[PDB]
Design a protein around this ligand. Sequence first.
Ligand SMILES: N=C(N)Nc1ccccc1
Length: 245
Amino acid sequence: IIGGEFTTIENQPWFAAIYRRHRGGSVTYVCGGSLISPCWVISATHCFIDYPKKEDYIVYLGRSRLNSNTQGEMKFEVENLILHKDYSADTLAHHNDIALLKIRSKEGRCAQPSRTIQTIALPSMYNDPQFGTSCEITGFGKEQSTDYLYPEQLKMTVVKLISHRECQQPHYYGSEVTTKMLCAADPQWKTDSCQGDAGGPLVCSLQGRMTLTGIVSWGRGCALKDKPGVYTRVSHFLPWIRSHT
Ligand SMILES: N=C(N)Nc1ccccc1
């Protein structure tokens, strides 16, 4: 997250921190995800496409720090890693960038709600906030495009939804963005998601209900003029989610 503010897990209790084991046993951060139900975390396919093996991943819930445990956090194994079969990757635009991870602890249990662990509601089909609406994003991604390290403390910021016509414009992303995608950014391009934030949630208040409107997917650089963050439009993949869950 470029700009924005630091936060702890209680301000995004459905945020999931996903890591991967390497040969030798070293563990590195992979991407963010969102708990949509006790046993299910939704993320982005591009995060796992190069390493499809579910056994290599570890998922944490109620975790506020990148490399240090958070009191009360839960650790999970990935019982099933479901990627979207229609996934595609272009110059930058990832299509159908959505994935599902079925979590299971070593005790064979799913998530246990608490003050630091809760689920986020899915939107109604094809029901998104009006463009210009302010929503929030969360993640452990870079704080600066040139940074080498990722922040140790979770972060969040606010970005406004951009209309498809605006984003489809030449100056923006042209045709790289589709109806199954949502663009969002700061009117001053001061804050935005960045490398490491993929898979994370774009949450909007829709009719008094915090809703998982999008999933951090892609973008040209970070916090650059006319280059918004692009998000998987969740309200357009409900049938997919339904069946796979
Ligand atoms: N918001 C962005 N400009 N770029 C971006 C970078 C990395 C992941 C997701 C989105």
